[PDB]
Design a binder for this molecule. Sequence first.
Ligand SMILES: CC1(C)CCC[C@](C)([C@H]2CC[C@]3(C)[C@@H]2[C@H](O)C[C@@H]2[C@@]4(C)CC[C@@H](O)C(C)(C)[C@@H]4[C@@H](O)C[C@]23C)O1
Lengths: 243, 8
Amino acid sequence: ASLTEIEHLVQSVCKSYRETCQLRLEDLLRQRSNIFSREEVTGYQRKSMWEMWERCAHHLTEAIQYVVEFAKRLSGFMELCQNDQIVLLKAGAMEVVLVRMCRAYNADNRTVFFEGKYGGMELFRALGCSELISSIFDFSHSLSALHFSEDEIALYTALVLINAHRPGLQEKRKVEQLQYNLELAFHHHLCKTHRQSILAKLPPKGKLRSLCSQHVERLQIFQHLHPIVVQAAFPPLYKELFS
Amino acid sequence: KILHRLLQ
Ligand SMILES: CC1(C)CCC[C@](C)([C@H]2CC[C@]3(C)[C@@H]2[C@H](O)C[C@@H]2[C@@]4(C)CC[C@@H](O)C(C)(C)[C@@H]4[C@@H](O)C[C@]23C)O1
C-alpha cells in the first residue's frame, strides 16, 4: 500500500526465488548441447513403465521441495494459518513447477533437461502417457515464446502460488491482500521494464489446472495397474500431493 | 503427514 513498499516487495520475491530455484539458469544453458544419443534414448524407451514413473516422480518431488522452500521465504506466506499454507501448496506447488520447468526447455530442438542431458518427448515413451507429455512440452514451448526474465518468473510464480480463489482457504481475505500486493509488484515491474505486452500473452488460469488434472488422471490409471509400486516406491510427498 | 513437517 505504497510505491516504495511495492518496489521493495519486488526485490524480496526476486530474492526468494534466486535462493530456491534448484538449477541455475547458466548451467541449464551450458548443457543445451549435451544431448542424449539415439542409443541412450532407446535405453530409456526400453525401461519398464514402472521404473520410469518412479524416476520421474522422484525428480518432480525434488523440484516440488524447492517450491515449498520458496513458499516459506515468500513475504507473507508464513504469516498465514497452517490450513491455508497447506491448501495453497497442495493446489499450486505443481503449477509452479510447470512454470519453472521452462528454464530447462529448449525451444530450438524441442528438448528438456533430464538426468544430466537434454531429450525430446520420445525420451518418455515408456511412461505410456503421450497426451500428458506433449501437453507439458507444448506448455513449456508457449512460455518460452515470452522470453521471461528470472525476475519475471519469480513474480509470476509467486502469483500462481498465492491464489485467493483456492477452495478450502479459511482466511480468504488475508490471501486476497497478499495476492493483491503481489499483483501490483509484478505489474509495476513490467511497467518499469516495458514488458506489459506479455500480460495478454500469459496462459489462461484454466491451463495450469488442466495440466495438473491430466497428471492426476494418468497417475490413477498407473496406480490402479500397479498399486504396490506406488505404495512402496513413490516418494511420500508425491503421494501426499497427488493421491 | 509430510507437508506439515516440512513447514515447521
Ligand atoms: C508427472 C510425471 C511423474 C509422469 C509423466 C512425466 C512427467 C511429467 C515428467 C516428464 C518431464 C519431467 C521429467 C516430468 C517430471 O514430473 C518433472 C521434470 C522436472 C520438472 C523436474 C526436475 C526439474 O529440475 C526439471 C529439470 C525442470 C524437470 C523437467 O526438465 C522435466 C520434467 C517436467 O512426470
